[model samples]
Structure formats: structure tokens, C-alpha cells
Target: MNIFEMLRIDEGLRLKIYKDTEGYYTAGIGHLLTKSPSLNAAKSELDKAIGRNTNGVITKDEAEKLFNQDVDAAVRGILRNAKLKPVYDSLDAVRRAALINMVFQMGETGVAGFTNSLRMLQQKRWDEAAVNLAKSRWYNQTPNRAKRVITTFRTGTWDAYK
Candidate 1:
């Protein structure tokens, strides 16, 4: 009859961590945490992080809206880096996308942590900037994704997927 009722019928309320129909480690009214959380897994580690009673479930529409918001947030994150805003605004699409991608994976402040790389990028020092970028902790965060951004830094194009 109402949204809450509809949700209850569609997704049974779960008061504790339990497996879903498809065998995923789920909780709440369908909050997926992982594929499988050991049955005997202690809650101590999760206790400090998750005090329980957290309403982590969201409707399909809500998830979609969150995705769009994240995309927008990523763009703003790239633009908010004061030192790199100038270079970011001037970057070719592919190159700019690299910064935004980094900001997306790492938080805006996380990406902004690469001060040397940002400095070189501001000076239009492509190679040096790329090197500076590679030397950072972000590179090892996700090598595959970082490579895509690095390729763009060396050559401004989406051909990184190539």
C-alpha cells in the first residue's frame, strides 16, 4: 500500500546479517556486503565499524540516483583541486577524464594529495607530470585503472583501452 510496505513485501526485513537468496552476504532489507561472510565470523571487527541498526538498504531508483550523484561529485572533485583546477579545465577530454577518474576512485582530497603531479600538470609538463603521477601512492592503489589515466597523461586520448 505504501513505499515501506511495498519494500517489506519485496525484501523481507533482516534484523541480522544473513545470506540472501543468491548466497550473497546480505543484511538489513537487502544490503549486500559480500558474496559470503563466514558463518562463524566474529562481529567484533565489524562492531566498531558497524554498530548495527544501520539502514543500509536502498531502492533501485535510489541506487540509480546515487550513481548519478557520484558522477557529478567526481566532476566537482576534479575541479575543486585548487592547484590543478587551471590544468584540469584546460586538459583535453581524455586527459581531464583521467583526473576525474582518479578523483572518483580516490576521494577529491585523495587525488589532490598528489601535489607534485598537479604542479607538473599545471606547467603543461606532460612527461614529467606523468612521471610524477606514477610516483604517487595512488598508482599502486589500482594499477589497471591508474594505467588508463597514465596513458592519457602521456597521450591525450581514450586509446588507453586499446
Candidate 2:
């Protein structure tokens, strides 16, 4: 599943926007719109918000004009720049997604810090990589989230989100 789709804006944020009187939007609660402007303007604002939220390098003002579209483009850019052919040629879709999610969340510099772990993964040394993933400083800082993604990688199932 797409990460953006998985990140359904929760009720608290929805109510916050409603109470704040940000413009109504059916696409997602955080999106703001004004009757004075066209749909394109509203989409531009939403895209900017998504870029800020994701820390993406691409400016929403340049091309993308919607939250989902910006996110999809960002994910594709990340995957492309990371040269995932080695991974895509090896792992299944679910596992590929899990790795991409982890890398996307952690970032290139942070992910690169896991050199040994990544090497293990490249070699399909599952148990070693799993151990390395859990034992890393990154995992120590965000134990719960790391555990979830790593567990998904290890188990080959989408049980982590549960």
C-alpha cells in the first residue's frame, strides 16, 4: 500500500482544522481552500503543506499541486535516486515497500549510516540484518516504529501496522 494512503489523517487533526475554521476539504482534513480562489490554488497550498511535513526537497510551488501527488512523486524520486534495482530485482513487493518506507523515514544520510546492516540485507543475510536493524542507534531512538518496520521485513507480512 502507498505510505500516503496508510497515513490517514486522524480525527484529532481533523477536528483541529474544523475548529480553526480552515477551509473545508473532502480530500483530506488538513487541506485548506477558499471560495475566492480556484481549485488549483487550494491544491497548491496542500502540496506545500505535504512537502513541509515530509521534509521533501522538491518545492510544491514548482510542479506538484496536491498532497497525494506530491507524496507519490517524492516516493518515486527517492526510489529512483536510491537505485533500488538491486533490491527490486531481489525482494518481493512487500519487503521492497518496507525497506523503502524505512529508508524514506530515516533519510539517505541516516540510512547510509547502517552500512553493515545494508550490506547484510544486500546479501540476503536476513537474520544478521534483522539483528543489526534492532540493535542500531536508530532503533534505540525510535524503538516502536523501528520494531514495527523491521518486524515486517523479517516476517514477510503486513502485520506491523496492526
Candidate 3:
């Protein structure tokens, strides 16, 4: 079993373009289509993009399958980087989990942008790695969260920063 089964909530499947609690054009299992312009532009582009049925509705099961694939990819991304392959094998579990969490926060593609910090961690230069990790835009945008997780990265202790 996967985490979706472990923690999936019933967001309910709807087949209409309805407003959410925030009045956004939300559908699916709580898909948040932020605003009118964004939704319109996205739907328009998505229709042209093919394979993305922007105007159509999805079943809860469909969304669940897509979400599951995403989670699997994201989880897989946490520990494997082409550049960090050999380095990853040398890492301790604590730092490994930290990398995974970072991957979750910033997708596999996004996490690849943290080149400097990943290298520091690969080098076992934990403090420098912490500094490099904290320097990410994710920190300025979410300082407390960055600190909370970076502590876990550095110390490997759960709830290290909070």
C-alpha cells in the first residue's frame, strides 16, 4: 500500500467547473484553479498541449492514479540525482530523508537546481551543506519551514528546528 491510501481524504469527485471554498474554479479531488485568467489561459493552452484535457472532468480514481504516479516519482526523486549518484550512497539516513523532503517540496526537476548544496551534502560538509540549503529561495520564501527541515538535514533528529 502507498501513502495515498494511508492518508487520502475524501475530496469527492465532481464533473463540473464549480467554485471552491475560495471561489476558484476548482474541480476533481480538490484541484485548485486559482483565478479566472489563470484558469482560462491554462485550459486554453492545455487543450492545445494535447494529452491534457483541460476542459474535461476526471474521475476520483483517475485523479488518484495520476496523483499516485506523481507521488511515486517525487519520492523516487528524493534519493537519486544523476550528479549525486555515487554521493547518495555515502549519505546517512537522516540527510537522506532531508533530501527526500526537499525533493517533495521542490519536485525532482526543481530539486536539481540546488546544485551547490547537494554537493556540500555529498562531501559530508554538513555545516556548509546546511548553509547552502538555507540559501535557497525556499528559505526566504519560507524561512521557518526551511529552518525546520534544514535542522533535520543537519541533525537527522525529527522536529529539530521547531
Candidate 4:
């Protein structure tokens, strides 16, 4: 599966505002309105995309645009982390996509906070990395998604999508 399609499948398409499981205001494809630098910035983008005040509605095109931008931001943020750079560079395309998925769901900072799991990832201890990730609250909160991500980490392939 393509990364975009994979992410869309996991996140789903939402054309209207809704509170995510963490209680943050979100719209589009997992777009975190609450996490933006400012409501002003978010409103500015929302206005341009929706061509007006949100009216609580976002079209599929706008949502796809936002998804692309968000994915770029997630990849850039993950690569910019000095501690993760080398590890990310060491990964195969599939594993890199798995990491990108994690960073997209959890912010890059959130993913970076998984010190033990990261260490295992850096060491290329795939099973150990999966185990460490499985131990986290993230795993408990989103078991199905976490399972797919963990499986990706362990197998360096798109088996999760399969």
C-alpha cells in the first residue's frame, strides 16, 4: 500500500470537526486543530482551504492537501531529531514508513519519548523494539493500530497492510 493510502485507512476521512480520542479538536484526516501553533494560524489555513469559515465542513480535496502537508511535517520532524536521524537513515523504506506512521499519530516528540523502544530500533533489534513499543500506554490505547505498527517494525515489509 502507498503511504498516503495506508495513513488514510488508519486515520479515516472526516469532513467535519470532531474531538479525537485524546479530546483534542481535530478535523480532516486526523488534523489536530488543537495542536497547531495558534488558532489564528489554523483558522487562516482553514479559511483558504474551505474558502470561508469552516462551517464545520472540510472537503475531500482540502483534507487530502492537509494530509500531505501533515505527512511532510511528520517526516521532517522525525528526521530532524538528531538522535533519530541515524536510526531513520538505517531503516528500509517499509520500516521508515512505519516510523512515519508512528510519528504522524503521536507527534515526533511523542514518538521520541519512547527511549527504550528507540534504543532497540537504533540497535536493529526488531523484536525487542516491538516489545518495548507494546509495553507503552499507546499500545493499550490503540491496540489495533499499534499492532500493525509493531508488526511493521518487526518485519521490514508491508505485511501490516497485507
lDDT of 1: 0.60
Q: Name the better of 2 and 4 by lDDT.
A: 4
Clashes of 4: 0
Say which prediction, candidate 2 or candidate 3, comes out ahead on lDDT: 3
* Between candidates 1 and 2, the lDDT winner: 1
Predicted model with the maximum TM-score: 4
Put down candidate 1 lDDT per residue, 1-162, tens digits, no spaces.
222322333345564556765565654544445554664342332232254423443344543443455557667766666765876887766677677666655567777778888777777788988887887665775566577678777877656654
Could you tally the backbone clashes for each prediction?
0, 0, 0, 0
Pairs clashing within candidate 4: none
RMSD of each: 10.9, 9.6, 6.5, 2.8
Q: Quantify all predictions' global Cα lDDT against the true fold.
A: 0.60, 0.54, 0.59, 0.84
- By lDDT rank, best first, the candidates go 4, 1, 3, 2
lDDT of 2 at 139: 79
Q: Write the per-residue lDDT of candidate 3 for residues 39-123, one digit (tens) a residue.
A: 6754554344335675755555655554555456655665466764555577776665566555645557777778888777777
**Poorest 10 consecutive residues by lDDT, candidate 1:** 1-10
- Residue 99 CA error for candidate 3 (Å)? 1.0
- 1 or 4, which is superior by lDDT? 4
Error of 4 at 135 (Å): 0.6
Model 4 residue 102 lDDT score: 89
Best by lDDT: 4
